């Protein structure tokens, strides 16, 4: 129980996150 | 009144309708409450912001079109 | 062909590089830039994640959204950078570099 | 040669996104592999967020669309007004697309070519606003309505919407033959077809010295076609009908997004059309005829749909009121009516889709609602309360400042008319609230709670029609400003 | 004494359009539609109300004619859904509103005529 | 600082909690509104405190834009006038909510909901200086009284009672609409202060004069349209029907004392005899048809309909006692009517009979509400030392003084005020008792009992007492009189 | 303290300056006079 | 059913069912409070606005009139409903519906006993 | 009748969470897409009751 062991999802996590910092980002940067 | 509270009023109150129009407890979820009042204050702001411009961009256009008129003798 | 490239509305801020490249204003994109071509790709390949469940296409859909968002981010910052270039943007950032 | 299609770029990626979803939707719902997903929920979706982003690349570049306007005169020209309305019709279609899903869902009905078909209408229609020629125009207006033909009869082995289809085929080629009759007629008697070189050697000169029948019988012929197009009396001979054969939420994109294209493209016809002897009181008796038609039909009508489409009649004349002055403020109280009646049609729809999980048919289905699910109750009778003009509403603003540019052309005979329809409409509308507010049947029927979609939308809707007269400031400007950059 | 609800039992004799008689159950006092819903010959969810102004038809039965003048006839609209909710804009003479038709006792053995089902979805 | 914004906001804020309570908490619902209400009425009273009775022009002004070009907008302000119908207004609901406390259960807090939006909304009409805004309010209290008539009606014909309530208004609302438009297209705006000041055409003084009467004779029960208030007024619950003769019959007959008035000098005085020739006829054949009624409700309302057509004798007789009577009528009505339709609906809120015929002989028995009954109908019997007769006899004066004939037959009418009230009086409490109908019943417990306090002091305070009320606002009336003219 | 003290002063400070009232008045008045002018020559414009 | 009505049980509005009420192919009309110890039988019919006295038995086939009372052991007649107890029926309904949205509130969706099943599956293995 | 209740009553979770999602996907028909598709949807077998038990 250490990896997630899921070649499709983890991306998908990882878009989304980065989503949220550009976001985040978008609101601070402008 | 500051055109935020209201905002952040206005997108709790259509939270709690939204969620109560569907026959659900009015506090589902917070989560979605507190980013629907963050919503509506960003809303509010920038609907006054934007009738400030509109109002600021339709004097400049009506002088212009008063003026286009005024050269007619 | 004749191409005439003219606004109407001109350019409130200075006019610099009336006509520019294309590799120019890709070579132009600012960090702003960059985060608003970021953002509308993620949210684009979340969207098309969390909607590709139920029928099953789990990854695929993903795929389709990415390519979608990636086009859609690429213009946006394509139509800022150039639109800041041509002038008629706040600029502050290129009087300075030129 | 690249930075002159910054003035049509999003089109261009709403066309390329169309094609990215078509050819995802007919590669994946065809596999062994996923044993052919419904892949329409996934498709509305992403078409939703599709039309979002061209949304936000139309507004965040309203200083663009403009440069290289020579390149693009020839084909078309979008001045402010063309923005404000662009920007307004994908809201519309972006809202229709939201609030049917759940129709994909509980309705089983997994066809995304539905989607694709919207997008292609959205494009046809986005086209069509800036379409600043007697070509452009009607190729536009083909674009869409080869779309709505097709997604009006999408529902192949029902019964309503197959024959609502081909009455609709029908009448719009029969429309689009009269009009394009209209467009050739006067091109041959004045040899342009551009709007600035049409503009130019008739408005100075229409009946004063002398007069041509050809170009005046092309007007006509013209305004005979826009006519049709948004079904107003006496030139609504199937209307109704389309209404309720075709899907609910076909009907709820029907009337709303290709209305907003054809006005405005009325609005961009009526800079040239300067005769004032052949286009206002046309549309002036055209005005009056659908108000009373209106108010006198949808009194008898025990359905939902065809109650909505009457009513949607009646507020199309009440809009060709405000055409019917021809000023400034004659076009403002049209922009402004245009935007509430939308946003008041999006509200009905919005309801009537969220009931049509039980399948709700006739007006006393809906009996007996104050008490299974009050809420809903009072958001449908603050809903037909905006659409009687009922003053502390939003749906009373658009009347009010209609019936008063009505007043500022001396048309005293339109303001009498237009209050007793509205006394005779506000009569069947709270007809609605007695049913199901005052009268208790002894059957009742149960309705399921509808998705967040809806609900969503249904809220936001109900707070701007409830809260509009409290700050009217900014559609009232905005208005101001697209009725008069329509002429400068 | 007991009120067994045998007493209120009416039974009819409903035909379909394929020419098959069919026995029928009902009650005394509610309507003939409801009578011929628990056999499912017409779709249930097609008629759910029992107003007179949700009609369209779809109730629509044919009566023989020693049937018609033991029920009271059509009074101002039940002849207007037949006469506007129809292929041929002209009454029958020999059909009736099946929800307008309640069940008496004396009324069993009443032959009904149920037609072909026609669209009702949208 | 006790500005008109809280009065209007406390209101909003009352009914904005309400909405998010859950049903079962029936115990905090009546509570929180029975406060909210009580609130409202101290802020209403406070500002009669500071209400500095002697400046000719407007109270606290509230302006906020309501057009991009601030053309016209929110612009709120008392005089002289439309004070004490503020503090009535919002003294007049709490006994709404206290009437119908016990069977709160059953309404639910969508009682409470339109009580209160009628509430603010009646605040927002008196206290509005712009003209259009005057009637989106004005027009504004449709939707709460068309839903009390409707949803918590007493028997089941409630249907047809409230459409004629609703499309009568709406015919005239629109017929003024029409004027508020020619109006604006003419001067230009709508601000009271300007309108007011502004040179009209003869030719269209009268146009618009009959514009404004189209619907100002529709809310004042007048000889041609007077139907809707008894059919829909008897056909509404006692909480809610106590306030359509209270506040809602008070819109037109004010609304002349604001908007046509001072608004067209020159056509009231071309159209007096009209208005004269109306009213005289309207106490006498709307009093006769009282005579020969049976249900309890309609003669009280049928009586209202008599005292506003003698209040409209007495208002448009422009003199500086005439309009003064008019107002000291109008709030002794507004209680009076209001007392006497509670004291009609307890009687149906333990019979269910609303009629003369069952009751009888109730003075044997309940003395406590046949005391009551008594003392109000006196009120309506127009006695001197009660607050009507400083009412009409001030409407009799201004009357005589313009005009003779009109004041005999405004007269008739309270010498025929004593042939159907005191008639009634004698046959519901102080006839033979009956076992056979009414088998048995109760007295007034300590709400209705309460209630009627505050009536029964304010009626004899401002009958024995009236110098405050015509002291707050004789220089308003002086004001209003004197206009156009400058002789 | 009595009761007179504790609401002359009261009430006095309540009333608010009757002088400043009719002058706003009268300069309201005033600019919305002007105002109406201005929007009645806005109104003037012809569509074309 | 013996009656040769479809056996499907169906529950109005406004019905109060009542402790140990042992339904089973009845039919039930709106507003039809029921008492405690009810042994409701195949094709048994109770009529609206009727009430049924605690401890009530009918066989199948056998119906309640309209706005009635009954009870005993069998189907048996007690009393005719007043107009002003009669409409107490609704208001008992939604009493208890208010009562049992008070106890709804009382837990939230999806109960945390999941994290009590991993701390007792870690004790011991997987 | 009480074999079907004793097999429902003790599906394991990763069973009856496969049985819940089928009977989702499988909770309305559409013949139009279907046949349009040339494709056609039957039931699963674990999701048929057996026939004893229908009327
Ligand atoms: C729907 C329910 C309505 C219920 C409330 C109704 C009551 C509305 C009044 C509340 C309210 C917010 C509106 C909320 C809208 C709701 C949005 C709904 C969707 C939300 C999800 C509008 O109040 C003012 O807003 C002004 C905006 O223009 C307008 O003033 C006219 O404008 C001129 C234009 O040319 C006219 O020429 C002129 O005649 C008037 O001056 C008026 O609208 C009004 O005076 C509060 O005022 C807010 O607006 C401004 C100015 O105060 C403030 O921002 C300012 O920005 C800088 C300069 O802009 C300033 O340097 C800065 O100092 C300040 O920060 C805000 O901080 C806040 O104060
Ligand atoms: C005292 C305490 C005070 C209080 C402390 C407060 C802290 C505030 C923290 C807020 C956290 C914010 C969270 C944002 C939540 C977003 C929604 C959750 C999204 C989510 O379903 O998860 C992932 C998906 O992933 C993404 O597709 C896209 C999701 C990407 C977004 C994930 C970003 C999470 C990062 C959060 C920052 C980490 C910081 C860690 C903080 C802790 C540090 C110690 C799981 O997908 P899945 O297929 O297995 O399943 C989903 C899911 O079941 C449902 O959406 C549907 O039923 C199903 O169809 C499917 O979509
Ligand atoms: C560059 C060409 C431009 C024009 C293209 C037009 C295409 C239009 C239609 C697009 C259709 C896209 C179809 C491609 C997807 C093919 C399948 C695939 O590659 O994804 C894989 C794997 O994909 C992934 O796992 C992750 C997807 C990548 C997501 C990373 C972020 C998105 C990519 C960024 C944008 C893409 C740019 C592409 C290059 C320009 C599928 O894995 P699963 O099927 O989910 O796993 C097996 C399932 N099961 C166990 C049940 C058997
Ligand atoms: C011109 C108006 C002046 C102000 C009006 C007040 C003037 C007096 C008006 C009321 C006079 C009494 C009429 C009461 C109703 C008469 C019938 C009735 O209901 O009787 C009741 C009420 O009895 C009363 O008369 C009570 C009288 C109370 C009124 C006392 C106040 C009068 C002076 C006040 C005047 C104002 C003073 C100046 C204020 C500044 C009970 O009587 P019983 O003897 O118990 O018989 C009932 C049978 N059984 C026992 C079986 C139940
Ligand atoms: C702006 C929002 C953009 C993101 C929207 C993602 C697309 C959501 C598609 C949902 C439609 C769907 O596929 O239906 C599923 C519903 O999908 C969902 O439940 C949630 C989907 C994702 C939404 C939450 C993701 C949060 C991210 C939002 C943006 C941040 C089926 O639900 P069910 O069968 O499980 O219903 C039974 C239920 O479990 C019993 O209670
Ligand atoms: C003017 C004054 C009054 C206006 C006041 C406005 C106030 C500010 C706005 C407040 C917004 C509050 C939102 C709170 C956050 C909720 C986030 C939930 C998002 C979400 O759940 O995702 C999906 C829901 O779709 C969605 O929720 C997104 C789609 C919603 C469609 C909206 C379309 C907007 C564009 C058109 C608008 C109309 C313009 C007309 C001019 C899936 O939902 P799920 O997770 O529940 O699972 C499926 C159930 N089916
Ligand atoms: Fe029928």
Same mark, same amino acid.
């Given at each position: ?30 | ?10 997108? =709790? ?33 920038? =609907? ?26 | ?98 | ?164 289809? =081909? ?278 029927? =149960? ?42 | ?122 | ?487 | ?48 | ?126 | ?55």
């Amino acid at each position: 129980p250490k990896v997630s062991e899921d070649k499709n999802r983890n991306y998908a996590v990882v878009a989304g996150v980065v989503a949220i910092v550009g976001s985040i980002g978008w609101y601070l940067k402008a | 009144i500051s055109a935020t509270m209201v905002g952040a009023l206005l997108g =709790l109150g259509t939270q709690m309708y939204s969620n109560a129009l569907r026959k659900l407890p009015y506090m589902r979820h917070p989560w979605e409450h507190v980013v629907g009042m963050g919503l509506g204050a960003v809303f509010a702001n920038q =609907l006054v912001k934007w009738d400030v411009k509109l109002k600021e961009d339709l004097d400049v256009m009506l002088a212009k079109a008063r003026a286009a008129n005024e050269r007619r003798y | 062909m004749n191409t005439d490239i003219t606004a109407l509305e001109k350019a409130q801020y200075p006019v610099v590089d009336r006509n520019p490249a294309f590799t120019k204003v890709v070579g132009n994109f600012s960090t702003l830039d960059y985060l608003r071509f970021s953002t509308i790709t993620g949210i684009s390949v979340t969207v098309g994640y969390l909607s590709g469940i139920k029928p099953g296409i789990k990854g695929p859909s993903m795929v389709t959204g990415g390519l979608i968002g990636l086009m859609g981010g690429f213009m946006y910052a394509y139509q800022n950078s150039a639109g800041r270039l041509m002038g008629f943007f706040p600029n502050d950032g290129e009087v300075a570099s030129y | 040669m690249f930075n002159l299609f910054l003035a049509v770029f999003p089109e261009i990626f709403i066309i390329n996104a169309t094609f990215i979803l078509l050819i995802h939707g007919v590669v994946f719902s065809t596999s062994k592999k996923y044993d052919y997903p419904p892949l329409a929920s996934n498709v509305g979706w992403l078409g939703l967020l599709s039309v979002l982003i061209t949304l936000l690349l139309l507004a965040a570049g309203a200083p663009l669309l403009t440069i290289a306007h020579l390149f693009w005169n020839n084909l078309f020209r979008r001045d402010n007004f063309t923005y404000f309305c662009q920007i307004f019709l994908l809201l519309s279609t972006a809202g229709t697309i939201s609030m049917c899903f759940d129709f994909f869902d509980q309705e089983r009905f997994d066809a995304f070519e539905f989607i694709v078909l919207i997008l292609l209408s959205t494009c046809g229609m986005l086209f069509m606003i800036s379409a600043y020629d007697l070509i452009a125009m009607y190729l536009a207006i083909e674009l869409q309505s080869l779309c709505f033909y097709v997604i009006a009869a999408s529902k192949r082995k029902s019964e309503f919407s197959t024959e609502a289809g =081909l009455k609709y085929l029908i009448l719009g080629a029969f429309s689009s033959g009269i009009l394009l009759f209209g467009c050739s007629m006067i091109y041959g008697s004045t040899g342009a077809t551009h709007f600035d070189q049409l503009a130019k050697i008739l408005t100075g000169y229409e009946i004063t010295g002398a007069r041509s029948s050809g170009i005046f019988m092309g007007i006509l012929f013209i305004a005979v076609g826009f006519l049709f197009k948004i079904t107003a009396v006496p030139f609504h001979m199937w209307a109704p009908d389309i209404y309720e054969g075709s899907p609910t939420p076909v009907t709820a994109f029907l009337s709303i997004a290709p209305k907003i294209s054809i006005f405005a493209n009325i609005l961009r016809v009526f800079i040239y059309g300067s005769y004032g002897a052949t286009l206002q009181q046309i549309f002036f008796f055209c005005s009056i005829a659908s108000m009373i038609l209106g108010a006198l039909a949808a009194m008898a009508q025990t359905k939902v749909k065809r109650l909505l489409a009457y009513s949607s009649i009646g507020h199309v004349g009440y809009i060709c009121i405000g055409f019917s002055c021809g000023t400034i403020e004659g076009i403002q109280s049209l922009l402004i009516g245009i935007f509430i009646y939308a946003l008041m049609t999006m509200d009905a729809f919005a309801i009537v889709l969220a009931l049509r999980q039980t399948r709700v048919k006739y007006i006393a289905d809906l009996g007996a609602l104050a008490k299974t699910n009050p809420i809903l109750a009072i958001t449908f009778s603050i809903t037909m309360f905006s659409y009687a003009g009922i003053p502390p509403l939003a749906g009373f603003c658009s009347k009010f400042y209609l019936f008063f540019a009505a007043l500022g052309c001396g048309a005293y005979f339109l303001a009498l008319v237009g209050v007793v329809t509205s006394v005779i409409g506000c009569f069947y509308y709270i007809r609605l609230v007695k049913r199901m507010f005052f009268d208790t049947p002894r059957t009742w029927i =149960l309705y399921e709670p509808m998705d967040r979609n809806k609900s969503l939308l249904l809220a936001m809707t109900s707070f701007f029609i409830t809260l509009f007269l409290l700050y009217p400031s900014p559609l009232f400007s905005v208005t101001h400003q697209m009725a008069l950059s329509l002429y400068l | 004494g007991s009120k067994k609800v045998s007493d209120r039992i009416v039974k009819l004799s409903a035909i379909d359009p394929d020419g098959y008689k069919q026995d029928i159950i009902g009650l005394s006092g509610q309507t003939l539609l409801r009578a011929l819903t628990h056999t499912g010959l017409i779709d249930p969810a097609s008629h759910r109300l029992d107003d007179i102004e949700a009609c369209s038809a779809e109730c629509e039965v044919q009566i023989a004619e020693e049937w018609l003048e033991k029920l009271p006839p059509r009074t101002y609209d039940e002849e207007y859904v037949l006469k506007r909710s129809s292929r041929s804009r002209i009454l029958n003479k020999h059909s009736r509103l099946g929800c307008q038709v309640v069940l008496t006792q004396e009324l069993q053995g009443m032959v009904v005529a149920v037609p072909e089902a026609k669209p009702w979805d949208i | 600082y006790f500005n008109l914004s809280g009065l209007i906001l406390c209101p909003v804020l009352g009914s904005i909690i309400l909405l998010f309570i859950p049903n079962s908490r029936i115990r905090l619902i009546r509570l929180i509104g029975l406060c909210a209400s009580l609130i409202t009425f101290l802020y209403s009273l406070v500002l009669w405190i500071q209400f500095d009775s002697s400046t000719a022009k407007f109270q606290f002004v509230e302006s906020l834009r309501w057009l991009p070009y601030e053309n016209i907008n929110f612009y709120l302000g008392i005089d002289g006038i439309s004070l004490f119908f503020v503090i009535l207004t919002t003294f007049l609901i709490p006994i709404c909510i206290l009437v119908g406390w016990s069977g709160m259960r059953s309404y639910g807090k969508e009682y409470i909901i339109a009580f209160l939006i009628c509430e603010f909304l009646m605040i927002a009409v008196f206290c509005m200086l712009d003209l259009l805004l005057f009637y989106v309010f004005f027009e504004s209290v449709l939707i709460p009284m068309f839903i009390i008539i409707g949803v918590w009606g007493s028997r089941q014909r409630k249907i047809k009672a409230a459409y004629q309530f609703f499309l009568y208004t709406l015919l005239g609302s629109l017929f003024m609409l029409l004027a508020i438009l020619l109006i604006l297209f003419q001067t230009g705006t709508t601000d009271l202060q300007i309108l007011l000041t502004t040179e009209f055409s003869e030719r269209r003084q009268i146009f618009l004069w009959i514009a404004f009467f189209a619907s100002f004779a529709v809310k004042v029960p007048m000889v041609p349209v007077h139907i809707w208030l008894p059919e829909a007024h008897v056909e509404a619950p006692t909480a809610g029907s106590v306030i359509l003769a209270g506040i809602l019959l008070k819109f037109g007959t004010y609304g002349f004392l604001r908007f046509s008035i001072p608004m067209f000098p020159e056509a009231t005085l071309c159209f007096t005899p009209f208005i004269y020739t109306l009213s005289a006829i309207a106490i006498i054949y709307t009093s006769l048809t009282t005579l020969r009624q049976i249900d309890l409700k309609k003669i009280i309302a049928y009586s209202s309909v008599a005292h506003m057509n003698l209040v409209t004798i007495g208002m448009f007789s422009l003199n500086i006692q005439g309009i003064g009577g008019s107002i000291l009528l109008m709030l002794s009505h507004g209680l009076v009517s209001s007392a006497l339709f509670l004291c009609v609906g307890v009687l149906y809120d333990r019979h269910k009979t609303r009629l003369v015929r069952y009751y009888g002989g109730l003075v044997s028995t309940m003395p406590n509400f046949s005391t009551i009954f008594f003392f109000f109908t006196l009120a309506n019997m127009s006695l001197p030392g009660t607050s009507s007769f400083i009412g009409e006899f001030l409407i009799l004066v201004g009357a005589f003084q313009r005009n003779s004939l009109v004041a005999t037959l405004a007269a008739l009418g309270m010498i025929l005020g004593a042939a159907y009230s005191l008639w009634l009086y004698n046959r519901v409490v102080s006839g033979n008792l009956k076992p056979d109908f009414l088998h048995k019943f109760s007295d007034l417990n300590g709400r209705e009992v309460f209630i009627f306090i505050p009536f029964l002091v304010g009626l004899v305070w401002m009958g024995v007492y009236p110098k405050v009320f015509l002291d707050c606002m004789h220089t308003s009336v002086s004001n209003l009189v004197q206009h156009g003219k400058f002789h | 303290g009595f009761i007179m003290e504790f609401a002359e002063n009261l009430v006095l400070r309540l009333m608010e300056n009757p002088e400043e009232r009719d002058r706003k008045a009268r300069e309201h008045i005033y600019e919305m006079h002007e105002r109406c002018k201005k929007i009645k020559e806005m109104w003037a414009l012809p569509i074309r | 059913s013996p009656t040769g009505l479809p056996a499907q049980t169906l529950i109005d509005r406004y019905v109060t069912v009542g402790a140990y009420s042992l339904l089973r192919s009845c039919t039930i009309e709106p507003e039809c409070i029921i008492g405690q110890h009810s042994i409701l039988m195949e094709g048994s019919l109770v009529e609206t606005r009727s009430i049924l006295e605690a401890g009530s038995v009918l066989p199948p086939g056998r119906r309640i009139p309209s706005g009635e009372l009954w009870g005993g052991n069998p189907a048996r007649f007690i009393r005719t409903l007043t107009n002003e107890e009669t409409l107490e029926i609704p208001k008992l309904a939604v009493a208890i519906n208010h009562l049992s949205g008070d106890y709804f509130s009382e837990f939230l969706p999806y109960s945390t006993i999941y994290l009590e099943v991993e701390k007792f599956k870690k004790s011991l293995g997987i | 009748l009480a074999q079907i209740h004793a097999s429902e009553n003790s599906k394991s979770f990763e069973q009856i969470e496969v049985e819940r999602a089928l009977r989702k996907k499988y909770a309305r028909k559409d013949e139009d897409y279907d046949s349009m598709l040339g494709i056609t949807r039957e039931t699963p077998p674990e999701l048929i009751l057996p026939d004893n038990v229908l009327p």
